Design an enzyme around this catalytic site. Sequence first.
Site, PDB file in Angstrom:
ATOM      1  N   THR C   1       9.944 -15.224  -5.787  1.00  0.00           N
ATOM      2  CA  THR C   1       9.536 -13.752  -5.797  1.00  0.00           C
ATOM      3  C   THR C   1       8.568 -13.654  -6.675  1.00  0.00           C
ATOM      4  O   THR C   1       8.692 -13.969  -7.808  1.00  0.00           O
ATOM      5  CB  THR C   1      10.805 -12.908  -6.058  1.00  0.00           C
ATOM      6  N   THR C   2       7.161 -12.805  -6.675  1.00  0.00           N
ATOM      7  CA  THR C   2       6.160 -12.735  -7.411  1.00  0.00           C
ATOM      8  C   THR C   2       5.674 -11.382  -7.198  1.00  0.00           C
ATOM      9  O   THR C   2       5.041 -11.367  -6.042  1.00  0.00           O
ATOM     10  CB  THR C   2       5.363 -13.949  -7.512  1.00  0.00           C
ATOM     11  N   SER C 169      10.357 -20.321  -4.295  1.00  0.00           N
ATOM     12  CA  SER C 169      10.820 -18.808  -4.081  1.00  0.00           C
ATOM     13  C   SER C 169       9.645 -17.964  -3.829  1.00  0.00           C
ATOM     14  O   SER C 169       9.710 -16.671  -3.915  1.00  0.00           O
ATOM     15  CB  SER C 169      11.553 -18.304  -5.528  1.00  0.00           C
TER      16      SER C 169
END
EC number: 3.4.25.1
Lengths: 232, 204, 191, 228, 238, 240, 240
Positions: C1-2, C169
């Site tokens: 996740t970013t 991720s």
Amino acid sequence: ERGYSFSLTTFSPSGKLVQIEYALAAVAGGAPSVGIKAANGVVLATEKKQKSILYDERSVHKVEPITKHIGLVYSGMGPDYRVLVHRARKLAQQYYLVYQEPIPTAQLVQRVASVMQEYTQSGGVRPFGVSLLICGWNEGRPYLFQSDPSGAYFAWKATAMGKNYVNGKTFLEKRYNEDLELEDAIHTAILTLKESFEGQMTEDNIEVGICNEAGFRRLTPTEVKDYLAAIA
Amino acid sequence: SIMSYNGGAVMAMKGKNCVAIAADRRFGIQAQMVTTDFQKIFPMGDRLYIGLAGLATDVQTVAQRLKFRLNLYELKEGRQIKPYTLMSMVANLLYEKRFGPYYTEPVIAGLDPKTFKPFICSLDLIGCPMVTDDFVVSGTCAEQMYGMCESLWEPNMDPDHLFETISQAMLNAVDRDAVSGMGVIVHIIEKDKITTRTLKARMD
Amino acid sequence: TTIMAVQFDGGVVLGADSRTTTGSYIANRVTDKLTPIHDRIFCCRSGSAADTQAVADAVTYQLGFHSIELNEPPLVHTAASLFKEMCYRYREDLMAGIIIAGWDPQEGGQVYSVPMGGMMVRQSFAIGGSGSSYIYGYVDATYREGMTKEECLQFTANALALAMERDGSSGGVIRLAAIAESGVERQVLLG
Amino acid sequence: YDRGVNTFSPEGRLFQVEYAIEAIKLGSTAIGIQTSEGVCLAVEKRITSPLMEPSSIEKIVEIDAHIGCAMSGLIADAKTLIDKARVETQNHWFTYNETMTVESVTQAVSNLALQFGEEDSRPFGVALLFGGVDEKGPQLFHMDPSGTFVQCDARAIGSASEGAQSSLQEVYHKSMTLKEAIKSSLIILKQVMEEKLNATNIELATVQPGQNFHMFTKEELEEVIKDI
Amino acid sequence: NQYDNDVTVWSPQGRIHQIEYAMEAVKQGSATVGLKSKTHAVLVALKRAQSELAAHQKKILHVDNHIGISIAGLTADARLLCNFMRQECLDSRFVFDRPLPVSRLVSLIGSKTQIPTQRYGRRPYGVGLLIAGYDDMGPHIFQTCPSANYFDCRAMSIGARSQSARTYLERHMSEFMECNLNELVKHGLRALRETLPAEQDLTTKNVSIGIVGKDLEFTIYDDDDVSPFLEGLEERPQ
Amino acid sequence: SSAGFDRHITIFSPEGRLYQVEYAFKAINQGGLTSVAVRGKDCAVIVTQKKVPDKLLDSSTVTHLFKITENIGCVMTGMTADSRSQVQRARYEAANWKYKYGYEIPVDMLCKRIADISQVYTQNAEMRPLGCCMILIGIDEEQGPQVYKCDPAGYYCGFKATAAGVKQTESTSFLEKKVKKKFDWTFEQTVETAITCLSTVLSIDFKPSEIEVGVVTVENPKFRILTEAEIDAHLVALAE
Amino acid sequence: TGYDLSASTFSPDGRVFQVEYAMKAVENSSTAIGIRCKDGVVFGVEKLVLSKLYEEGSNKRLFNVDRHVGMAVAGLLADARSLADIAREEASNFRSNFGYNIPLKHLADRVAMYVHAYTLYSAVRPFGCSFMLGSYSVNDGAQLYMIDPSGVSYGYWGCAIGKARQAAKTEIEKLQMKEMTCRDIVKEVAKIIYIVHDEVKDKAFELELSWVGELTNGRHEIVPKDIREEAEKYAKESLK
């Protein structure tokens, strides 16, 4: 609040309960209704006239379902009716959450009348001003019950609540019999509602619900216009 | 485990117009027996029984709590209880103790009160209903009871051969178990009568 | 996740990946990581999925009720205060990486950062998520004061794609959003 | 209207509290006198029947081994007051290793009487006299249902207490002795009651500094009657 | 007369009579006079006997090392407010480690007595508290009332026939700011002697004088130490 | 008759009546106000006057048009203090529908929940039954516009042309003569009858700055309060 | 009248006299006026000395609710002290939940609903207070509000509360308040007080003037008209 907690009802020296007998007077001055138990169904009918030509008819209903095989009508005052309807909805689901089976009509009246009992004995509240007629076809035979604001209940073949009920009581006794069909039962249910109606009876002056063994069903004005289409 | 603290085995089997149920008789702590007359099958109305197996505390506890709710049901309504209705009643009682659960697995067997239709079901320790058409088993020696019923069961059976099938299924499977035995009682019911028989088993 | 947020002269620019994973298995392949609260205020969420969805519903309930009483558009600093009052209170129970951004008529574009602790701070640009550690050296050597809108859309596209290069991720697809006085322009970038 | 449960007068006090004072007037008389040698005390039993057992009527109780008591008016409400008066002197010894003083007993007793109503019902109908020897010598106190607490040197309460207090202020002076004050009190007793003064009508209660024992004379009182 | 029953019921003239009746309970108690200089605030009360040989009922009672109060009215409402008064004084010592400002403690009393003057189920507090104190900005003389109003003042007398004491204070209030305690105390107890019937005199056994000072802790003198204060007085002009 | 305490609290009298609620029906009438709602078309129109007796009194803080949600507006008659507290429940429970159920509340469902709160004040004693009245408008998808009306007794209904305040019996008699030839209601036929009813019951023929007009339409379903300039545009448009 | 005991009962014509009785208890209090210029709000209270022993600044009726909000109460003074502590407590929760200063339009709604709740139950009585609310901001300007004992709350440009409610607003409205500065307002407030019965049949009085606006940078405090004393120098010249 304070927590006053005192009932507004005590005994007379004669032994009668005064406020319950006053609440039946508001029941008798309500809109008239009639319910007839036939050999294969239960027919409910009522009197729905607006005070103006402005009032919409698709907003408020009189015949009201409880489950898909149980309906319920009334004769009394308007806003007190919607309380015990929503009370009977949540009560009927609690039987279904425990037993996984739709509630019989005898068992529902055992508990709705206990709710109307509770406002007569408890503190500071007033009793209801609405009597009911509860219907349904469970386990082959259909049923038709009537509950009063005192908290009791009965089991009728054909009855009438509202205004001019003593005239409809004699008329149903002189017209009903041991058995009819449901389609014959609606014919004698409007003819007892035509006794106390106004000068005009249309698809929007009356409102009729039925109980076949296929389930509960209230009628759209298309059938009710076609039913009163010159068949009395 | 906690289920293996007292042992037990309850089997039900569906016939043509009849249904049978059987259980063991041994009561005991982990390796020491106490008595051979411990009741594990309880009548709940006519032509409808229930069997319990697991922890011996919850066997006697749930059978009294269910009897508490049955008599209040059969007085508000003049009718008797349907076999589908009791299964929903037991599953409500086990799910209320979702995180404090009773350690038992009930087995319900009986006929329809109106017709002759049999009914068998079993539940988990938290109330998952599971109806079948041939047999249900519960207890510690479960895997031995599946091996006997999958090979001996026939679809349409008279009460003669149904008794002989559930007899050989219970005797050969419980004798393979160590913590179960000391006698087997068999109930076989039908529309006309109820027959209870006890079997000649190994008392070791 | 970013997740990514950059303000400019007109308003703000948001951006995120999708790739909702569990263990080493991608459960959701394309995901709206940015959520509307009001017509001018967005938030991009990070951390536990079930925790951040429950908080974003309650803040939308409270802020949406609050602006109808005042008959005024809400402030972006007002919305960032409501996330602080829940994350700091219900700490040791939630793992939320909320970044609040949006345009306001009183102040223009604003970007706030509420990390897993519960503090609140205004920033010029803001990063967050698991893959945000890899672009921290790129984002401050490339940032320049006084960008236009089209530079910031170019800025966050290259900035996310380096965190979305391979890191387990992150990746998937780029969802961008630009909030200004005129409207909200949302677009999906691939290839 | 005329002043129900909790409502002020147009002029003065609450009449529920004012009518609580009148309930003491139908009680039994009692006299307590403070002397520098000790505290003497007396009461009238008002025994009606011979079958009625005499020693079951208590008026002097023992709050503690150095604190006596006296009561009049309602007996039913007085048993509530004596109960916690014994408890909270015992709680004081539990947390301080010392005897509670005679004045600070009735501080705690007068807190509970000013609590009638619905706050967290009716006022009480009982007056009290407390004798005791604390570190400041012997003491004597008195309370009422209004919570008005005061120290007295010689006090008579109960029925015919108005005529008792008139003659009692003449016979009192600061340099009494304890043997003088006991017979000085029972002369006032037989002049305000109507029965013949014997060993069954009255009873005494004395407390001394060196004689913290014996708060209750029993048939040594027969000697005091024949001496007068 | 039907409006004269409860605190809740308003009148057709707009005056609640139950609050108006709790003022009358203040006039039942005896008189007490409080005043202050630039540096010293002294309140003087008047005891009343119950019988000819009982002890006189006390009026002035210590509260804190910089706060002392007088009393007039019901003794039931007296000690009930005192236990609320002492609890608030030691909470600021326990939490803030400072003594309370006197002006904000009395604002807690007006919030305390406001609820039983509006909600049904509790009568108003029949009480006549006079308050003397020391915050960081000098002495203060406060009074309260059962209508939950509190009045800052430089001199005040309340109780039975206290109007004659007020007339003495108004024509001598210009002299109060400069004089010290040797006459400031006996400026005050010259005001009590007009609240007496003209045949008896203020003796040593029926009066209490409490002094709190800028460098002096609040001290109650009674029945033995009043004699250095009652010396050097004239009689009434009879 | 006055039996027991029927004239004072909410109990039954003889003949089944009860007076403490039908005293609240003319608790509206001390407002000195009249509100008219008209449904004719794919639109819906509220019209209600303001009464400003003071030049020190403001203009923006007089408005009885209240915005419940973006699609639902309402007008309040009766006394002012009970009116604004009734709207605080209507703003509150319209948002609980969005939170619990995930979509926008119907105008029919909201008028039920408001009248159910006015039920308990009639049912329970020592609780004053809110002498004010509420009229709703809004757009329902696949149902068109609706106009609802709530009572202090807890009774509600939906109907096409509405009067409230003081002069119901003169305005509703005018609208039945109006709505008997169901002509083409074309969003200016609706506004013109909304004015000409109130301009003849009150009989004022008034200045452009004493009324408000709330509107909703199926081309822009947002609730919308008209501007003094465009109020004047419709007012001179009926000057024939 | 007998049918006027509880606050939860209706009259046979439809009004509550317990609210009506508490309104004219505010009438017996002294006059307190309020006025706002284009960049501020100026308060002013006629306050009378009780006898002589008042100590020049006790029991004031110019409170201070927030950093920019204060009150101008009149009526029962003890009942206004408890009501002022509600507004102090209400503005603190808005700070702790939203992080900025309370708007005056939202603050007056929260207070008036709290006053409304004491007009419904038989256990409690309505308040006997009426007051003013003035504030100033850079995004909202200056506002001035007005709350009766019933709970009706809306905005004015100028007002008066006391005996001379009508007798003060006669000469308030002859001022060009839309363009004056609130330093010129202060010398104009003092003559409105001294015209109408300052010490004519009364004994004595003392003027208090509160002050908020652009010159205070949003702060609310009392005037420095102990400095230069210009209010009384300019108003006492209006003797002829």
